[PDB]
From a paper:
Ferritin represents a ubiquitous class of nanocage-like proteins that are primarily involved in maintaining iron homeostasis. Accordingly, ferritin plays a central role in taking up iron (as Fe2+) and storing it in a stable and unreactive form (as Fe3+-oxide/hydroxide). The crystal structure revealed that TgFer presented a typically 4–3–2 symmetry in a cage-like, spherical shell composed of 24 identical subunits, featuring highly conserved organization in both the ferroxidase center and the 3-fold channel. Each of TgFer subunits is characterized by a four-α-helix bundle containing two antiparallel helix pairs (A, B and C, D) and a fifth short E-helix that forms an angle of approx. 60° with respect to the four-helical bundle.
By contrast, we also observed that merely one copper ion (Cu-1) was present at site A of the ferroxidase site in TgFer + Cu and TgFer + CuFe. After incubation with Fe2+ ions, the site containing the Cu2+ ion was not replaced with an Fe2+ ion, and this was confirmed based on the anomalous difference Fourier map. Similar to the crystal structure of TgFer + Cu, two Cu2+ ions with occupancies of 90% in TgFer + CuFe are bound to the 3-fold channel based on the anomalous difference electron density map. One copper ion (Cu-2) on the outer surface of the ferritin shell had six coordinated waters with the Cu–Wat distance of 2.52 ± 0.20 Å, and the intermetallic distance Cu-2–Cu-3 in the sites is 4.25 ± 0.34 Å. The other copper ion (Cu-3) positioned deeper inside the 3-fold symmetry channel is coordinated by the OD1 from Asp129 residue (distance of 2.68 ± 0.02 Å) and the OE2 from Glu132 residue (distance of 2.78 ± 0.04 Å). In TgFer + CuFe, two Cu2+ ions were tightly coordinated with the Asp129 and Glu132 residues of the 3-fold pore, similar to the structure of TgFer + Cu, and the Cu-Cu distance was approximately 4.5 Å and 3.9 Å, respectively. The results revealed that copper could be able to compete with iron for uptake in TgFer + CuFe, likely due to the preferential binding of the Cu2+ ion with His residue (imidazole nitrogen) over the iron ion. Similarly, significant differences in the iron contents were observed between TgFer + Fe and TgFer + CuFe proteins, which were measured at 2,637 ± 2.46 and 240 ± 0.97 atoms per cage, respectively. In this work, the crystal structures of TgFer + Cu and TgFer + CuFe had been solved by X-ray diffraction analysis at 2.3 and 3.9 Å resolution, respectively. Obviously, a low-resolution diffraction data not only present a challenge to structure determination, but also hamper interpretation of mechanistic details.
Numbering used by the authors:
A (entry chain B), B (entry chain C), C (entry chain B), D (entry chain C): 3 to 170
The structure:
C-alpha cells in the first residue's frame, strides 16, 4: 500500500532494486581501476583521476535511483556488492575496453528496466529513465569509445603517457 | 482544420479541456484551505503560506495546459468550477490528508490523458505531459506524504505550531 | 619486492586490505540509513543528510587507506561488500545506537591493525593510523554518544522532530 | 647537564649528529645531479629544477634536525661531507634510480634512529621523527618510484624530453 504509491507495479520496484545494486558494482569496478593507476608500477594519475570521477558518478546514479525509489513508494532492498573480476587491469587501452563492455552492459540493463515500466504502463518511470539515465549512458558510451580509438592511435609507451597529460 | 493542427486527435483536445477544469478545481480547493489557516481561530500563517503557493501552482498549471491547447490548435472550452466539498478542513493533518488524495486524483487524470495521447500516436503531447506534469506530480505526491508522516509524529498541540514555524 | 617497499611486513599489507573492506561496509551501512530517513514514512531529511555525509566520510577513509596501501608498496585486494543486516532501522535513537557499536567495532579493528604494525616495528604506519584514523574515530564516537543521550532526553514524537531541525 | 635536557640519551644525541651529516650528503648528491642536467650536453632544465628543489629539501631537513638537536640540549658535532660517488649520473632513468636507493637508504637511517629513541624511552623524539621525516620519506619514496615507472614507459629519446616538459 505505502503512502505515495500510484501506477507503480511490483515488477518495477524489484527492478529498481536490482538496478541499484548493479550501479554500485559499476562504482566499485571504477574504483578498482582508480587505484590500479595510482599503483606505483603504472602511475598514470590522470587516468586514475578519470575513474575516481566515474566511480563517484555511478555512486550518484545509484543514489538518484534510490531517491527515486522512495519518491514512488517502493522500498530499498540492498544486496551484496560483488568484487570486480580482476585486481590488475593491464594496459590503459585494455582497461578502457573493459569499461566499454561495462557501460554497454549497464545500458542494456537500463533498457530492459524501461521495457518493464512499459509493460505495466509506467509512463513517468519511463521518462525518468530515458531523461536521467539513457541520455547519460549514450554520452558515456561514446566518450569511452572515443578514448578507445585514440589509445589505439597513440600506441604504447610514449603514447600512453602523452594521452594522460593532454586529454585526461 | 485550424492552422497548427497536426497529429492532434479531438479526443486529446477534449481531454485537455476536462483536465484544465480539474487543475483549476485544485487551485480553488487549495485556496479554500489557504483562507482556512488564516481564520482567526486557526491562525497558522505558514500553513496558509503553503496553500497560497500551492493554489497558485495549479492555476499556473492550468494556464500551461491552456497555452498548450492553443499551441496544438485546439480550442479552450471552459466550464464551471465546482465549490469544494468542505468549508473547513479540520486539523493540519486532516487537511494535508485531503490534499494527498487530491493530487493523487489529479495524477491519475493526467495519467489517463497520457493514455489518450498514446492511443492516437501523439508523441509530443506525451512528452509534454510526462515532462511538465507527471514529473512534478511524483515529487509533490512525495512532498505531501512527507508532511503527513511528520504531522503524525509531532502530534496535536505544540507539535502543530512548531511544524508551522520550522518546516513551512 | 615491488618498488617503494621498506619496513612493510606481509601481515600489515593484508590488514590494510582487510580494513579497506570494513571501511566500505561502514559506508554501505550509513547509506542504508540515509535512505531509511528519506523514506516517506519516516521523512527525517536532516537525519538522512547526516548519514549521507557519514557514508561519504567513510568512503574517503577507505580511499585514504588504499592511497596509503599504494604509497607503501602493497597491493589492493578487494573483497565482496556484504549487505547491512537490516533494511529498516527503527527509531532515530535505535539507529544512532546501531551506529555507535558500528564505529566502536570499526575502532577496535583499527586499534588491532596498529598492534600489528607495532609487532613488525612499522613506526610510520603506526603514526599514519593514530594521526589520520584513531584521532578521527574518538571524535566520531563522542559525537555519536552525544546524539544518543539527547535523543533519550527529547523522547519520541515532537522530540524526534525538533532534534532533526535544530541540531542536525 | 645542559639547561633543557630531559629524557634525551646521549645515544640519541649521537644519532641525530650522524643523521644530520647524512641529510647533508643527500643535499650534495642532489646538487651534483642539479648541475648535471644543466650540462650543455644534457640540457634538461626541468630535471635540473627538480634537483635544485630536492637538494634544498635535504638541506632544510638537516637544519630542522639541527634546530631539534639544540631544542633538546644536544650539541651539534659536524663532520666532513663526502663527495658523491659519481660525477655524472647517466640517463634520467639511471639518475632517478640512484635517487630511489638514496632516499631508501636515508629512510632506514631515520628508522634506525627512531629505534634509538624507542630504546631509551624518548616519546617526543619518536613523534618528531615519525611526524616530520618518516611521513615525508614515504611520500617522496613513492614520488620517485612514480617517476621511474613513467620514464621506463616513455623510453629514450623524445620520451625523455617530453617528460621534462610536461611532468617536471
Ligand atoms: Cu550509470
Ligand atoms: Cu498540478
Ligand atoms: Cu572511519
Ligand atoms: Cu630528507
Amino acid at each position: 500500500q505505502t503512502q505515495p504509491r500510484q501506477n507503480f507495479h511490483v515488477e518495477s520496484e524489484a527492478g529498481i532494486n536490482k538496478q541499484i545494486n548493479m550501479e554500485l558494482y559499476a562504482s566499485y569496478v571504477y574504483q578498482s581501476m582508480y587505484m590500479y593507476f595510482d599503483r606505483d608500477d603504472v602511475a598514470l594519475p590522470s587516468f586514475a583521476k578519470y575513474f575516481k570521477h566515474n566511480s563517484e558518478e555511478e555512486r550518484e546514479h545509484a543514489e538518484k535511483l534510490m531517491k527515486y525509489q522512495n519518491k514512488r513508494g517502493g522500498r530499498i532492498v540492498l544486496q551484496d556488492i560483488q568484487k570486480p573480476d580482476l585486481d590488475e587491469w593491464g594496459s590503459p587501452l585494455e582497461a578502457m575496453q573493459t569499461t566499454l563492455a561495462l557501460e554497454k552492459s549497464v545500458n542494456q540493463a537500463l533498457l530492459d528496466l524501461h521495457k518493464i515500466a512499459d509493460k505495466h504502463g509506467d509512463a513517468q518511470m519511463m521518462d525518468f529513465l530515458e531523461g536521467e539515465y539513457l541520455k547519460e549512458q549514450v554520452d558515456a558510451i561514446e566518450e569511452i569509445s572515443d578514448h578507445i580509438t585514440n589509445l589505439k592511435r597513440v600506441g604504447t609507451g610514449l603514447g600512453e603517457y602523452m594521452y594522460d597529460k593532454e586529454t585526461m
